[PDB]
Structures are given as structure tokens and as C-alpha cells.
């Protein structure tokens, strides 16, 4: 039965590939060739939020587009006010090795996680003054690579145990388990309606998941190496992923195949973080060569370079209002651009 | 407007004061990444030095070592995390010839990594007593797994323990030279390997780690403060 199942899987893959090729009537680049390019994009360091003692792995802009939270290897979770460069909060962490941080849409909670295998939800709005560890979510058996709040009670966390988990914070137990990845899941992005989410893993494959059903709706395989970044297009019908083969790739959910590749011959370092502008025209990616790139998501031509970090760029963020883009790097610096 | 901004400035002042205190505490401790495999006495090293993290203090200097054992077999993404540590303490069982090649491959991967090409490695060739027993017994031959051992002569700078069979010294220094070949093949001078012959009952590994870390910090100071 094993050989029969392998043959059936191979035939299914072949016919899926044939169907995707049939749907590939024309390329995105050819259709977008008519429109004029955006030209060079000028961006500059308005604020240099400093105070982190070690590398920053994750940041997250608030829905208010003013406050952000950053996680550093020194065991510190600093909530900055980007406008005034004043550290609103500085939460010590039980585990110094933090690789993810999230900021709730309500703004009342933040998320932390990493090598401790535990997602720590911190309540910012506490009656007794300073912040306190609200709750801890355990059940993952691999590091936590990324965290995203569905709402104040539900959080979806990707782990290096090749799984994702939907947690109800109040009960504290893993409501849903998403399984099917064969490698470490390094990033996930929530759709604007918070009904589907795409997770990128180390098996060079992204997966579109339905949170209610708990089953893998789609699987996209277009990359060559580990996927470290992923983010939905603003319309929610597409998403761009960044990988270690120095390529970003755009997939569309309905087309169910790769649409466009953002890469250059001079670029050999792998992606660490991707993001879109408010309209989605610009795709901002962070690289290992200490500099961020800003591609034209429609024409696959680089439109700008954000070279202001002395170490690896590790986290990217774009405000929901669209004012600014924040880059956090391993030089213990987080900077704001616009 | 200004009323809330003054409060925000005072809160930021308190945050920065606490953050300066935390910086003073943080820079005064040195992080070590403990690496190894099963049947290698990394746990024995930890316990004889008095889980995930173990804290020790020597010469009023505080080190805390991390043994990451809660993950799967793949190491890439969480070995990217330990790039700021002062030293990677790699423990390998010298007796087990079967897994010697696996440990050599792991050492090569750590050495040649883009984010680990600056961290020096303190190499602990643990379980020397078992290696001596294997060499003296003669049932297991190192040349079976490493044919070039049949062409290996003990280095002139070797310092064998008094009353030791030269075959055991030859085996020890052969394994050490196999690791040092990877160490010096692409070291570039930015990082170095510090091999040590340790056993289960050894009670001075903390001093070795301390001296090696002091040497690493001295070399780092020499490299950075060339222009002063």
C-alpha cells in the first residue's frame, strides 16, 4: 500500500501542476509591463529608537499606528512610542531567548515567545500599575517562531515543531492544531478578515490554513530553501514570502501558484522579513546584507534601499495607517522610516 | 498635551534608569552555548560544575551556560540565535568512534556558519577514560573508522599524562588534530578552537572555561581597540 500511495501522491502532484500551468495563461510581469514604474523611493531614518541591549528579532506595530513593541535577545520586550521616542514600557522576560513578539489589536495585550516553547501573554492594562505576566500558553514542543493575535482571547502561534496552534487565552489550552508542515514554521500572517492565515515553513513550502476548520486549505511550493518571512497582500488574496535563496515570491490564493519573483544577481543573502505598503504597491524586504530593499511588487524592479543598519536586519513592520516603516536589526537598533 | 507629555518623559526616564542598571548587570555576565550529542557527558560537565541553563561563578566572574535540549534534531534556526555568546562549548565523546564523524560534521557546520564564524569554540573531548580503555583493549581499532590514523604520529608538542600508554596519547591527539584541522582550515584568525581532554571525574572544567573566555575577551579587545 505504501508504493500505491506514493504513486497516487505523485499523480496528484503532477495533475495539480498541470492544472496550475493551464491556469497560467499569462505572467503577472507581462500584464504589469504597460504601467509606468514608481521610480526611486526615498526613505530616511526619522527616529532611531535605541535602548535595546542585544539583537532584536521581532517587532509589531499597533493598530493605532503610533506604539510598537520590540523583542530583544537580552530578555527585554520594549514598547516604544515611535513619535516621541519614549519607551512607554519595558517588560523583563523569564526567558532571554525571545524570537517573536505581537501586539494585540485592542492594544491591551502583548505576546512573547521563543526557545522557552511557551507563549507568554502580558496584560498591559493592569490596575496595579506595572505590567504583569497575564498568562502562559504551553503545548508546543519546538520553539515559538511567530505569534499573531486573532483578538484579545484567540492567538495563533507558529512553532519549530512543524505545527501551528490556535489558542483560546482564557481557557489556556490549545483550541486547534494545524499540522502538515514537514519543517520548522518560521512565519505566519493573518488575513485582514482573520479567517485564513498563511504559514511559511523550513520545507520551502507555504500553507494557507482556515482557522475555523483547522485543515490545510492550500499548499504553495515555489521556493528553494527555508522560508523565513510571509505576509498577506492588503486585499488578502495574495501573499509574499521571503526565503534563504535570496528570492521573494508572490503567490495568489485563487491562482494557487507563484506569480512573480523578486531577486537580483547581486543579491545572495537570504530574506529575514517582508512587508507590504498600505496600498500593496511596494514590497519591503529585510536582508542579511544589513540593508533593506523596497521592490515594486507589480514590476519586480527594486525601487529603494534602506541602508541604515550595521548588522543583519531581522524584523520589518508597516503601520496600519501607512505613515512609517520600522526596521529592527541585530545591532540592537530599531529605526523608523517614511 | 504637555501635561501627559511630562508624565511620558518621566516614565521614559525611569525606564532608561532601570535599563542602564540592567545593562550593567547584563554586560557583567558571559553567555556560553553548550552543544553536544547523546552519550556525551555535557550533562555530567554541567552537574560537576554545580537543564536548559546552569549558572557558575569563577574569579568573581559570572557565566551562565545554555543547554538547548527541548527542540527537534534540526539546529539551523535556533543556532542562529546563539551568535552573540562569548564561546560555544562543544562536548564530544572521544570513546565513541561511530559518532566521531557526526561530531566532526557538527563542529564543521558550527565553524563555517555565517552567524557563528566569530564565536570561538571550547572543545571538550570528554570520556577520556573510556577512550583509554578502548585503546588498551585493542578490540576496536581507530584505523577502521579513520584510515589516516594508520599514518599518524604523535605531535612533538603533545603533553601526555605521566604513566600513559603512547597509543592512548596518539589516539587522543589524533582526534584533537582532526578537530583542529577543521578549526584552522577556515578560521581566518577571527575565532579559534580551545581543545581540552576531560573525563567524567574531572573537577576543573570551570577554570578551563574561565581561562579560555579570558583569552577570547583579550583577543577581542586587541582586535577592537587597535585604534584607541
Amino acid at each position, epitope marked *: 500500500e505504501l508504493d500505491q500511495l506514493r504513486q497516487e501522491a505523485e499523480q496528484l*502532484k503532477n495533475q495539480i501542476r498541470d492544472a496550475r500551468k493551464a491556469c497560467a495563461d499569462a505572467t503577472l510581469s507581462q500584464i504589469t509591463n504597460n504601467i509606468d514604474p514608481v521610480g526611486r523611493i526615498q526613505m530616511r531614518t526619522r527616529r532611531t529608537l535605541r535602548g535595546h541591549l542585544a539583537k532584536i528579532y521581532a517587532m509589531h506595530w499597533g493598530t493605532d499606528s503610533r506604539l510598537l513593541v520590540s523583542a530583544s535577545q537580552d530578555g527585554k520586550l520594549i514598547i516604544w512610542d515611535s513619535y516621541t521616542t519614549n519607551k512607554v514600557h519595558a517588560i523583563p522576560l523569564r526567558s532571554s531567548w525571545v524570537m517573536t513578539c505581537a501586539y494585540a489589536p485592542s492594544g491591551n495585550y502583548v505576546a512573547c515567545g521563543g526557545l522557552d516553547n511557551i507563549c507568554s501573554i502580558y496584560n498591559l492594562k493592569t490596575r496595579e500599575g506595572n505590567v504583569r505576566v497575564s498568562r502562559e500558553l504551553a503545548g508546543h514542543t519546538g520553539r515559538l517562531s511567530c505569534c499573531r493575535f486573532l483578538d484579545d482571547n484567540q492567538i495563533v502561534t507558529s512553532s519549530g515543531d*512543524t505545527t501551528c496552534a490556535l489558542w483560546d487565552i482564557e481557557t489556556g489550552q490549545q483550541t486547534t492544531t494545524f499540522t502538515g508542515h*514537514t*519543517g520548522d514554521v518560521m512565519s505566519l500572517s493573518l488575513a485582514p478578515d482573520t479567517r485564513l492565515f498563511v504559514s511559511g515553513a*523550513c*520545507d*520551502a*513550502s507555504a500553507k494557507l490554513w482556515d482557522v475555523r476548520e483547522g485543515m490545510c486549505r492550500q499548499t504553495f*511550493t515555489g521556493h*528553494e*530553501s*527555508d522560508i523565513n518571512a510571509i505576509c498577506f497582500f492588503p486585499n488578502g488574496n495574495a501573499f509574499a514570502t521571503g526565503s*534563504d*535563496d*535570496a528570492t521573494c515570491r508572490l503567490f495568489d490564493l485563487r491562482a494557487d501558484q507563484e506569480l512573480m519573483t523578486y531577486s537580483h544577481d547581486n543579491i*545572495i543573502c*537570504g530574506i529575514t522579513s517582508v512587508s507590504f505598503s498600505k496600498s500593496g504597491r511596494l514590497l519591503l524586504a529585510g536582508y542579511d546584507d544589513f540593508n533593506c530593499n523596497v521592490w515594486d511588487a507589480l514590476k519586480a524592479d527594486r525601487a529603494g534601499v534602506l541602508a541604515g543598519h550595521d548588522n543583519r536586519v531581522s524584523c520589518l513592520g508597516v503601520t496600519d495607517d501607512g505613515m512609517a516603516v520600522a526596521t529592527g536589526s541585530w545591532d540592537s537598533f530599531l529605526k523608523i522610516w517614511n | 498635551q504637555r501635561n501627559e507629555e511630562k508624565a511620558q518623559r518621566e516614565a521614559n526616564k525611569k525606564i532608561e534608569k532601570q535599563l542602564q542598571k540592567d545593562k550593567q548587570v547584563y554586560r557583567a555576565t558571559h553567555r556560553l552555548l553548550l552543544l553536544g550529542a547523546d552519550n556525551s557527558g555535557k550533562s555530567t560537565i554541567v552537574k560537576q560544575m554545580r537543564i536548559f541553563e546552569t549558572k557558575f561563578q569563577v574569579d568573581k566572574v559570572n557565566f551562565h551556560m545554555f543547554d538547548v535540549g527541548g527542540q*527537534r*534534531d*534540526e*539546529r*539551523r534556526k535556533w543556532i542562529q540565535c546563539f551568535n552573540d555568546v562569548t564561546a560555544i562549548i562543544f562536548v564530544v565523546d572521544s570513546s565513541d568512534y561511530n559518532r566521531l*564523524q*557526526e561530531a566532526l*560534521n557538527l563542529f*564543521k*557546520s*558550527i*565553524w*563555517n*556558519n*555565517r552567524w557563528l564564524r566569530t564565536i570561538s569554540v571550547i572543545l571538550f573531548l570528554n570520556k577520556q577514560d573510556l577512550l583509554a580503555e578502548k585503546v588498551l583493549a585493542g578490540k576496536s581499532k581507530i584505523e*577502521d*573508522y*579513520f*584510515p*589516516e590514523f594508520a599514518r599518524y604520529t604523535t605531535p612533538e608538542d603533545a603533553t601526555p599524562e605521566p604513566g600513559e600508554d603512547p597509543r592512548v596519547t596518539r589516539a587522543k591527539y589524533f582526534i584533537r588534530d582532526e578537530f583542529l584541522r577543521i578549526s584552522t582550515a*577556515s578560521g581566518d584568525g577571527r575565532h579559534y578552537c580551545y581543545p581540552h581532554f576531560t573525563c567524567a571525574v574531572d573537577t576543573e572544567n570551570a577554570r578551563r572555561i574561565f581561562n579560555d573566555c579570558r583569552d577570547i575577551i583579550q583577543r577581542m579587545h586587541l582586535r577592537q581597540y587597535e585604534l584607541l
Partner: nanobody, 128 residues
């Protein structure tokens, strides 16, 4: 999709010869260091051989050194393992392992349970 298909192998008497071919699809072959990794019955994965991007730096496990040869044909995107002087200890399932990232000299691809970019493998049995 990153696919590695192994061809060759089978039952061979001791001292025989075999050629293991490896067709690679879904990635640029010339940008990755390649590995041959074998799993003997009753034991976990064992790294056998590896060859760099251009074939300049080949390295072997001492157990199979002097008998096995590793090679690449970047034009044909194929990896070859010339297995010579076979032994009963050399019976195993053979796999191609691509190193995780391009232009790197480090590799973590002997994962016991699941490695992302390892082939299906072919059985090579050496017995009379």
C-alpha cells in the same frame, strides 16, 4: 518543488560495483553543496560523502573512504555516487541531501526523523 530522485542500487555480491544517480529538480544545482547520506537497517542516518558547489572540495566518511567516489554534473543537474569494493556493512538506504542554504559551507542535513530537502532513497544490499 525541491525534488531529489535517486536511481540505481539493488542486490550486489560483496566486492561488486554500483552507480547511484540523483536527478535534482526545483533548484539551481550549482549553488548548493550536495551530500550522500545512508541509513543502515537498525540504526539512524549516517553521513557518507559530500561535494561542494563546483566539485572542488569532496570529503568522505573514513569507513567508505578509498572505495566510494562522489561527483556532480551541474550541466545535467545530476549527482553521482560510484560505489566500489562493496562490503556487507555497506547495505543501507541511500539518500541525496541538499545543504539547506546556497553559497554556504555549513550543512545540517542528517536529521533522523524528517529533513526537508532529502530524497526518497534507494536500497543497496550487499550479500551473497
Amino acid at each position: 518543488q525541491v525534488q531529489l530522485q535517486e536511481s540505481g542500487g539493488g542486490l550486489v555480491q560483496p566486492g561488486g560495483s554500483l552507480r547511484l544517480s540523483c536527478a535534482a529538480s526545483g533548484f539551481t544545482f550549482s549553488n548548493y553543496k550536495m551530500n550522500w547520506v545512508r541509513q543502515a537497517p537498525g540504526k539512524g542516518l549516517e553521513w557518507v560523502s559530500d561535494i561542494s558547489q563546483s566539485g572542488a572540495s569532496i570529503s568522505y566518511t573514513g569507513s567508505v573512504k578509498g572505495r566510494f567516489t562522489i561527483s556532480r554534473d551541474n550541466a545535467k543537474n545530476t549527482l553521482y555516487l560510484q560505489m566500489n569494493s562493496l562490503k556487507p556493512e555497506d547495505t543501507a538506504v541511500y539518500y541525496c541531501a541538499r545543504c539547506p542554504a546556497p553559497f554556504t559551507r555549513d550543512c545540517f542535513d542528517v536529521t533522523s526523523t524528517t529533513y526537508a530537502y532529502r530524497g526518497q532513497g534507494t536500497q543497496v544490499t550487499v550479500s551473497s
